[PDB]
Amino acid sequence: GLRDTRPGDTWLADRSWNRPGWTVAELEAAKAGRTISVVLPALDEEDTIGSVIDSISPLVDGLVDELIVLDSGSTDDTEIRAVAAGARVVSREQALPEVPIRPGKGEALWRSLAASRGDIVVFVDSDLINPHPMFVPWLVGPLLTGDGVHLVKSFYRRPGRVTELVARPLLAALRPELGCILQPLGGEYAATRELLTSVPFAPGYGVEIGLLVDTFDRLGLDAIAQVNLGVREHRNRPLAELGAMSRQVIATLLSRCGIPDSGVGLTQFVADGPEGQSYTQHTWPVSLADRPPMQAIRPR
Amino acid sequence: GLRDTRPGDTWLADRSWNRPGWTVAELEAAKAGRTISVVLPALDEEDTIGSVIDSISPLVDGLVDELIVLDSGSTDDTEIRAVAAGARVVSREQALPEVPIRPGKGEALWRSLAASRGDIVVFVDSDLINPHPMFVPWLVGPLLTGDGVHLVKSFYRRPGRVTELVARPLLAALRPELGCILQPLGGEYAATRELLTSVPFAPGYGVEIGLLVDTFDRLGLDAIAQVNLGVREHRNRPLAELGAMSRQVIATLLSRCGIPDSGVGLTQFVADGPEGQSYTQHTWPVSLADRPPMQAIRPR
Ligand SMILES: O=c1ccn([C@@H]2O[C@H](COP(=O)(O)OP(=O)(O)O)[C@@H](O)[C@H]2O)c(=O)[nH]1
């Protein structure tokens, strides 16, 4: 299976593989009265968001029932360019007005549960460079087929340091069953509303890993599938921010495993000059504050 | 202090700094009947080891009482080239014949406690490219001065991903007091025999971080100093091995913090081709087996 795999192919828990042979029209037939929402979280991606929407556009009013951009505080042209591309833009305020806003990606995805209605929600990063139009159908495939699958995680090929050095080694240490997950931190994935609204959402960059572990702990490995997305292009992370991202992944995973995190942010020491004559001290925030299951706030 | 610092300058626990103004001859006078051993662990570094010894050579029979290369299973010309450079080569077998050998750096450093005699032991990696001749005196300075200092950690400028993304964020999470340590994984450091023989030694690449945490837990922050080594050149780590190194750092730190590690090695999935058609599954070993305090085996 891993010795021969294609963009679309599905990996299940019991080491078994599947190469899908359906059309998108056949997949919409498999729905059986289930609705699909696509949510694109966006903080300042005016350059790429149009192209991302365009890749998913033609599925709307067919496979996809709604396409939402969750505007996470953008001050560029994200909103207007997303509207011109034919997406409904919902701000964090509009999504859930009765709860004060916290910073970070986790917050945005959590709020999008209140703004969306689909029985199935698909998340796709809005900074992807020319995403394959088959991303969404490939992600929903294993949910619409039905093996008691509740979370579909993607894997892909680089055309991350935090994934390979932090998330995956800590998973081996603390949740070794999740060692089969190739890309635990990836932003392209799909899940049932059932699962999503029943679990807490980790803050900031902890969100994906928290969901992964929460899904595993509550529903076991059989509820998780992996799908090959093929080549995944996206804008590279600036090197400065990787320490902060790692620290948050660590905080979220420790908390899921019942290990007390100090709540103390990473302090980085940045050499000011070539000789190392002076260092700039930079401390990034880390959060231990999950949001509760959406069922406790805005229940269906 | 961090806003103005020089190779040699010392950082203590109470945020206080020190710029040393002694000669190496004045430092040998400060000894007061204390012996200093330099230990160079070496697994296949025939190209660099001569130069490393040459940088420390002139201190022998003066500041340094003995200079030992701990040969960790070399099959190149490490031994003969280290002898020609004027170092005493001791194999892992010769160091401690009554205990079976385990693989890894930790093993080598632990055995070197049995092969060396100095009241103070200085460790220096043998793959350093043209190390500054003042490395050893800069490392022993804070021990010979006396503030109840038992461990001297170096920091330096790149002319690591695992340090910045794994070791330092996990320290903030689990031992936030150790957040002030710039280079927790560095191989250039000095300590008393007193401390070194009283603590367990972590296996493989866990060794430095284990010592750091063990020192902190038992003697507190005041027993640890940091010294600026300046620019530190060394051969770059091949990218493949970084996952394995991270996994071991994780295992060692978790164990020091009382957190159960699964003992399950990191499995890496290596794309065999550009499309991501097939993956090679590669699982690196991780060890949870410390060596006990040398006092329990070969006591002074
Ligand atoms: O506070 C935030 C930060 C990120 N994002 C969005 O979440 C996705 C992932 O963000 P980023 O690209 O920085 O994360 P990475 O690729 O490094 O995992 C992108 O579409 C961002 O626009 C967001 O909505 N709110």
Ligand SMILES: O=c1ccn([C@@H]2O[C@H](COP(=O)(O)OP(=O)(O)O)[C@@H](O)[C@H]2O)c(=O)[nH]1
């Ligand atoms: O099993 C081992 C592996 C490493 N080394 C030595 O320990 C030092 C650090 O090894 P390496 O350069 O691979 O570690 P890194 O610089 O990546 O921390 C070097 O002098 C190696 O020759 C050793 O004695 N035994």
Ligand SMILES: [Mn+2]
């Ligand atoms: Mn991105």
Ligand SMILES: [Mn+2]
């Ligand atoms: Mn090295």
